[PDB]
Amino acid sequence: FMRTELAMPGLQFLSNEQFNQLFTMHGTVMLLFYATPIVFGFANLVLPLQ
Amino acid sequence: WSDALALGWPTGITPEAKLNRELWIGSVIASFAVGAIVWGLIFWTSAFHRKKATDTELPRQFGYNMPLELTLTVIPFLIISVLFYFTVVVQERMMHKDPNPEVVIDVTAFQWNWKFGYQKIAFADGSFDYDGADPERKEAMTSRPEGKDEHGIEKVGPIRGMTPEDRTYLNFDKIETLGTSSEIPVLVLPAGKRIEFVLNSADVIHGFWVPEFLFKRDVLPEPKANNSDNVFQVSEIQQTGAFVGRCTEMCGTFHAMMNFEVRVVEPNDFKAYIDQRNAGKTNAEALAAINQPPLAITTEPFESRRGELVPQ
Amino acid sequence: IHSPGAGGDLWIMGLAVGGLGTILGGVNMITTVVCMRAPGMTMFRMPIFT
Amino acid sequence: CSAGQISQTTTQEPAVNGVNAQAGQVSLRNVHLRAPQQTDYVEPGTTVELLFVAANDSTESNKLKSITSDVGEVTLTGDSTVPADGVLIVGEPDGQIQAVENAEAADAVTAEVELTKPITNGLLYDFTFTFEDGETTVAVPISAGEQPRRPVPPAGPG
Amino acid sequence: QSALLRTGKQLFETSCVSCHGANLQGVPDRGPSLIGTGEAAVYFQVSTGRMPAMRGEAQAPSKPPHFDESQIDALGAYVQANGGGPTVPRDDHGAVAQESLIGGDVARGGDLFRLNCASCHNFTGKGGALSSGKYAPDLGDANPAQIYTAMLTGPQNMPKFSDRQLTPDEKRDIVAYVRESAETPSYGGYGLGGFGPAPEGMAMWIIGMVAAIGVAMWIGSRA
Amino acid sequence: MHIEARLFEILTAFFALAAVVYAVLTAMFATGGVEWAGTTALVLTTGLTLITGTFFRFVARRLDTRPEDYEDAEISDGAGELGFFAPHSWWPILISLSFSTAAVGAALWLPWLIAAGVAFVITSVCGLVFEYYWGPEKH
Ligand SMILES: CC(C)=CCC/C(C)=C/CC/C(C)=C/CC/C(C)=C/CC/C(C)=C\CC/C(C)=C/CC/C(C)=C/CC/C(C)=C/CC/C(C)=C/CC1=C(C)C(=O)c2ccccc2C1=O
Numbered sequence: 001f002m003r004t005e006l007a008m009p010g011l012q013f014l015s016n017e018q019f020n021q022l023f024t025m026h027g028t029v030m031l032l033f034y035a036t037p038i039v040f041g042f043a044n045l046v047l048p049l050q
Numbered sequence: 051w052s053d054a055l056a057l058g059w060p061t062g063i064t065p066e067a068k069l070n071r072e073l074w075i076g077s078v079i080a081s082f083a084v085g086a087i088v089w090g091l092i093f094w095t096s097a098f099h100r101k102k103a104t105d106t107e108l109p110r111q112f113g114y115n116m117p118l119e120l121t122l123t124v125i126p127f128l129i130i131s132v133l134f135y136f137t138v139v140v141q142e143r144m145m146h147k148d149p150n151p152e153v154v155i156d157v158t159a160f161q162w163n164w165k166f167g168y169q170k171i172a173f174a175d176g177s178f179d180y181d182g183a184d185p186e187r188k189e190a191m192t193s194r195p196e197g198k199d200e201h202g203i204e205k206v207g208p209i210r211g212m213t214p215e216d217r218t219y220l221n222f223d224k225i226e227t228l229g230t231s232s233e234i235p236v237l238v239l240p241a242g243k244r245i246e247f248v249l250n251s252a253d254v255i256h257g258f259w260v261p262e263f264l265f266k267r268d269v270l271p272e273p274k275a276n277n278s279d280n281v282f283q284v285s286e287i288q289q290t291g292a293f294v295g296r297c298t299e300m301c302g303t304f305h306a307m308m309n310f311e312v313r314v315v316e317p318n319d320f321k322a323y324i325d326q327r328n329a330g331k332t333n334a335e336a337l338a339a340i341n342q343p344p345l346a347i348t349t350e351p352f353e354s355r356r357g358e359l360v361p362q
Numbered sequence: 363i364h365s366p367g368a369g370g371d372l373w374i375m376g377l378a379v380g381g382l383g384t385i386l387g388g389v390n391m392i393t394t395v396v397c398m399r400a401p402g403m404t405m406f407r408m409p410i411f412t
Numbered sequence: 413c414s415a416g417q418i419s420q421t422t423t424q425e426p427a428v429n430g431v432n433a434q435a436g437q438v439s440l441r442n443v444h445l446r447a448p449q450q451t452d453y454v455e456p457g458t459t460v461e462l463l464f465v466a467a468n469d470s471t472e473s474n475k476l477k478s479i480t481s482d483v484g485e486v487t488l489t490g491d492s493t494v495p496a497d498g499v500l501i502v503g504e505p506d507g508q509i510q511a512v513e514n515a516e517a518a519d520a521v522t523a524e525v526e527l528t529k530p531i532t533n534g535l536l537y538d539f540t541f542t543f544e545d546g547e548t549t550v551a552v553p554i555s556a557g558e559q560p561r562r563p564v565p566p567a568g569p570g
Numbered sequence: 571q572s573a574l575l576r577t578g579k580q581l582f583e584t585s586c587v588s589c590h591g592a593n594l595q596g597v598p599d600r601g602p603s604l605i606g607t608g609e610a611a612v613y614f615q616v617s618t619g620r621m622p623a624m625r626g627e628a629q630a631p632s633k634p635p636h637f638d639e640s641q642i643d644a645l646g647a648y649v650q651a652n653g654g655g656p657t658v659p660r661d662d663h664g665a666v667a668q669e670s671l672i673g674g675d676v677a678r679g680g681d682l683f684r685l686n687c688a689s690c691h692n693f694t695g696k697g698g699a700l701s702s703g704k705y706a707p708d709l710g711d712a713n714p715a716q717i718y719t720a721m722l723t724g725p726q727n728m729p730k731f732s733d734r735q736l737t738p739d740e741k742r743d744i745v746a747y748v749r750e751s752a753e754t755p756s757y758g759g760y761g762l763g764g765f766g767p768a769p770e771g772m773a774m775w776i777i778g779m780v781a782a783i784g785v786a787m788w789i790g791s792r793a
Numbered sequence: 794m795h796i797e798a799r800l801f802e803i804l805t806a807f808f809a810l811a812a813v814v815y816a817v818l819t820a821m822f823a824t825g826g827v828e829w830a831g832t833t834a835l836v837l838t839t840g841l842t843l844i845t846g847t848f849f850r851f852v853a854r855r856l857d858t859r860p861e862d863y864e865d866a867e868i869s870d871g872a873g874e875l876g877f878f879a880p881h882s883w884w885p886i887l888i889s890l891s892f893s894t895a896a897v898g899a900a901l902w903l904p905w906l907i908a909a910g911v912a913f914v915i916t917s918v919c920g921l922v923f924e925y926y927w928g929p930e931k932h
């Protein structure tokens with residue numbers, strides 16, 4: 001959604017605050033809800049095995 | 051070749067910007083050399099395929115090369131130490147803090163636009179008997195004799211005896227080039243002079259960044275109380291003309307709509323502009339009078355409409 | 363004062379809840395390595411990932 | 413996505429009686445009529461005031477305010493060419509603060525209309541505000557700015 | 571006042587010109603024009619802290635005030651001078667009147683509140699939900715001056731109750747009822763919010779039914 | 794547990810050095826003297842590592858070399874009764890749900906929901922802790 005909006009100079013389909021929420025939650029989700037929880041996902045996966 | 055190798059760094063317009071660009075070119079050259087050698091190593095060890103001629107015999111199975119490890123952990127330290135020395139010498143000219151600025155601009159950045167005060171002007175050649183106002187810096191000391199209770203509390207104030215709604219840290223000036231949502235502010239500066247910027251934020255943190263200054267600073271609400279050196283100087287601005295400037299820290303929803311301009315004009319043009327602003331006139335009127343486009347030519351105050359598909 | 367909405371608050375508490383799970387997960391992996399190990403796996407022979 | 417491009421808060425008119433007419437370079441704000449009426453209509457031949465604020469949008473100015481007259485013969489006493497990246501406050505809307513309390517160009521461009529036609533509160537009456545840039549019909553209302561209730565007679569049950 | 575107007579303009583310039591130009595004309599599609607809104611509207615909004623709004627959404631939420639009493643007065647005076655409109659009530663000294671706004675009659679205030687206010691807020695001043703993302707805030711936090719100015723001006727989706735529609739006496743009575751309902755202790759135990767059926771059913775199903783089921787598990791056997 | 798303790802001892806040494814140098818170079822050469830945020834954080838992460846390493850060192854000195862910590866140890870040496878490891882349990886999800894209720898109560902400032910979530914957290918933690926100690930029903 002950020003990419004589609006940023007492809008053109010105008011605000012085609014997003015609003016200023018809707019875009020602002022996107023990188024907050026994208027940055028949040030990807031880091032804290034995908035990247036940090038999956039180190040313990042891999043740890044739980046193989047660390048006892050290893 | 052330099053422009054392409056700069057990776058889209060604008061050619062600076064100040065001595066500090068030029069020096070920073072040179073440091074960036076050097077550091078990018080070093081980084082590309084390191085990347086080239088490492089990518090060569092990777093694409094050359096990719097030539098160590100499992101050759102079908104490899105019989106039932108596993109590789110050398112060595113690992114554990116102490117001298118090679120020592121060499122490749124010594125050289126990176128040398129590289130980064132050279133880069134650090136260059137960084138420090140360049141940093142030294144990040145804020146020389148010359149106690150004799152040629153023009154001082156009070157840059158106060160509120161929610162979603164800018165305002166420029168022209169706190170003081172003192173040309174080295176001798177001119178501009180001008181100064182900032184500061185009658186309007188009125189405090190908000192909540193030092194009432196008594197509060198809700200009957201006696202005893204005599205509350206002074208939450209923070210250092212004052213209230214968060216203080217705004218005393220802000221400074222105000224006679225000539226204010228306030229930027230409206232439909233009128234991009236154009237701070238006009240004399241060419242060839244030393245320009246100091248005293249940076250402040252009315253409401254929230256955001257960031258003053260003139261991309262062609264090759265330098266940004268974060269206008270914070272109360273930099274003095276936050277141990278932030280908001281005020282920063284620029285030794286000179288060689289090239290004239292209009293240079294875009296942008297907001298480079300989170301301001302709120304309209305963080306992308308805080309663009310401004312820093313129009314560098316000749317010292318005589320600045321004389322005329324400041325005289326005509328002392329006379330009752332707006333920034334656009336003064337620009338037109340000094341025969342320079344009134345509206346920001348590098349950017350527009352684009353639509354206040356929430357977007358394209360909104361029904362007007 | 364700025365960003366007064368509920369979404370901002372839910373974000374703050376959502377990280378606090380998720381943060382605790384990350385902290386507790388760190389206690390398991392660090393305690394697992396320190397305590398639970400094979401009879402011959404010394405600390406300098408456990409794999410690099412562990 | 414209640415904070416998208418079509419947002420309630422952003423798409424709001426001011427909670428004021430006067431209408432808004434952005435047509436033309438100069439934008440009209442809180443344009444209403446002060447026409448205190450004691451009965452069904454404000455009878456023709458009685459002068460009532462036309463309050464509004466003309467705010468200039470472009471600083472490059474449209475300070476003329478040529479005629480701004482319609483059915484009612486609106487006359488602009490103390491007319492002046494104020495709007496230049498600024499405001500022109502024709503009259504004194506109820507509650508207006510006397511920011512000066514002195515005769516600055518006498519009245520501040522007060523617009524008054526001799527009706528020549530009955531008007532009453534609750535109706536909309538077209539007024540053509542014409543600056544040198546252009547002309548715009550505004551459909552001004554009647555506003556009882558700060559006047560309290562007029563005592564309705566007590567009712568005798570029947 | 572001259573200096574008050576100057577201070578109000580100063581604060582306006584560095585607070586809200588991004589949403590209503592220096593002329594107070596509304597910025598198209600960011601904020602409405604402040605011409606005619608009035609000192610009362612400015613006081614209500616800024617004192618409640620609602621207005622220095624940092625997002626465009628269904629409803630601008632309330633939040634801690636961004637200006638003290640003197641600065642709020644400066645903003646209100648500046649906006650009144652620019653546009654001219656309703657003025658916040660004030661007492662003999664000059665400060666915003668709050669105790670004076672407590673109407674003597676409270677049954678009349680309650681009847682008026684139920685006819686007009688409870689429509690969307692609640693029986694006893696709690697909040698209520700509105701069409702799409704909007705809501706009526708709970709009145710417990712509003713002081714008498716804020717309640718009176720909230721009636722006097724329609725902030726957003728609240729009908730604007732002019733003085734002719736609700737004369738200052740009726741508005742004072744409504745303020746008195748609001749304060750009484752907010753500060754009145756709940757007779758007959760903890761008042762579960764103010765909403766009866768939903769909080770009460772939840773409290774039943776949790777407290778009473780967990781107690782009953784746990785006591786049944788204690789008395790009886792598992793098999 | 795010699796290496797286990799030494800890891801934290803090394804970390805403590807590094808963090809103590811970092812805290813000291815930060816405090817000195819911030820008390821002098823900073824805009825407003827000691828930063829008091831980075832300084833305190835560095836001091837108390839030094840404390841984190843110091844506590845953990847001190848406990849590990851106490852344990853290492855109190856313990857004879859384990860098969861785990863002993864090079865050249867056969868599997869039979871460590872073979873024996875491993876301790877209790879909790880089998881299947883559905884109390885963790887209830888604890889997480891109760892803490893989520895308390896968290897949403899804190900976010901949406903709902904004191905009633907905060908109280909309910911805290912009560913549920915107490916109940917769920919009690920269930921988890923008592924899971925393997927609750928005796929048979931006595932009828
Ligand atoms: C319900 C059932 C067993 C049906 C059998 C299948 C059948 C013959 C269906 C034909 C009828 C049809 C068409 C049914 C579909 C919909 C339906 C049930 C309509 C009729 C509704 C009716 C008259 C009776 C249903 C009553 C019923 C069995 C409710 C669930 C009761 C149970 C097992 C509760 C769990 C026990 C327990 C510890 C409860 C307390 C814990 C909490 C908080 C549970 C969640 C919770 C509940 C359960 C509330 O009721 C509630 C009410 C108001 C506010 C909040 C809550 C709330 O949070």
Ligand SMILES: CCCCCCCCCCCCCCCC(=O)O[C@H](COC(=O)CCCCCCC[C@@H](C)CCCCCCCCC)COP(=O)(O)O[C@H]1[C@H](O)[C@H](O)[C@H](O)[C@@H](O)[C@@H]1O
Pocket residue numbers: 695696708709710711751752753755756759760761762763772773776777904905906908909
């Ligand atoms: C066996 C029965 C056991 C029952 C327990 C009884 C609890 C006793 C509570 C304390 C004594 C009685 C208080 C009576 C006086 C009183 O009413 O208490 C209010 C407080 O109220 C709150 O805030 C809540 C505070 C949180 C603690 C209480 C929460 C208990 C809940 C959890 C019990 C029900 C179970 C529900 C489970 C939910 C989970 C579902 C899964 C306090 O004033 P205040 O805080 O200012 O209320 C505002 C006005 O002012 C203002 O105008 C008004 O406008 C409002 O803003 C108002 O809040």
Ligand code: HEC
Pocket residue numbers: 618620629630631632682683686687688689690691700704705706707708709711712716717720721725726727728729731744745748
């Ligand atoms: C929907 C119709 C509506 C009715 C009629 C109405 N209100 Fe409201 N009220 C609202 C809405 C919507 C808001 C939100 C305004 C805002 O946030 O700017 C509000 C806000 C308020 C506030 C602000 C509270 C705070 O803490 O910010 C008060 C006080 C208030 N109303 C009291 C009253 C009183 C007194 C009446 C007397 C009849 C009344 N209301 C009638 C809907 C209504």
Ligand code: HEC
Pocket residue numbers: 161421422424425426427428582585586589600601602604607608611612613615616621622623624625629630645723724725726
């Ligand atoms: C875009 C962000 C925004 C900023 C920042 C902002 N406003 Fe507003 N203003 C709005 C919006 C949107 C409304 C109508 C919806 C609402 O009030 O929630 C409004 C309405 C108002 C109203 C009520 C109008 C009426 O008719 O009831 C007043 C008074 C007001 N603003 C004054 C101010 C003052 C004073 C400030 C500076 C302290 C300010 N505003 C800052 C956007 C803003």
Ligand SMILES: *C[C@@H](COC(=O)CCCCCCCCCCCCCCC)OC(=O)CCCCCCCC[C@@H](C)CCCCCCCC
Pocket residue numbers: 413414
């Ligand atoms: C503004 C428009 C544009 O955005 C979109 O259209 C994206 C919508 C994505 C689809 C969302 C569906 C709702 C979630 C369903 C989850 C399963 C529920 C069944 C089980 C109980 O759209 C909008 O109007 C709003 C867009 C924002 C939507 C946010 C959704 C946030 C999800 C959150 C409530 C958590 C979901 C729980 C998932 C549980 C499954 C794992 C256990």
Ligand SMILES: *C(=O)CCCCCCCCCCCCCCC
Pocket residue numbers: 018021022413414415416
């Ligand atoms: C409404 O007011 C908020 C609009 C938010 C705009 C951005 C859209 C985010 C959607 C991401 C996916 C949500 C979670 C998906 C769960 C299945």
Ligand SMILES: [Cu+2]
Pocket residue numbers: 256257296297298299300301305306308
């Ligand atoms: Cu910015």
Ligand SMILES: [Cu+2]
Pocket residue numbers: 159160161162163254255256257297300301308
């Ligand atoms: Cu900003």
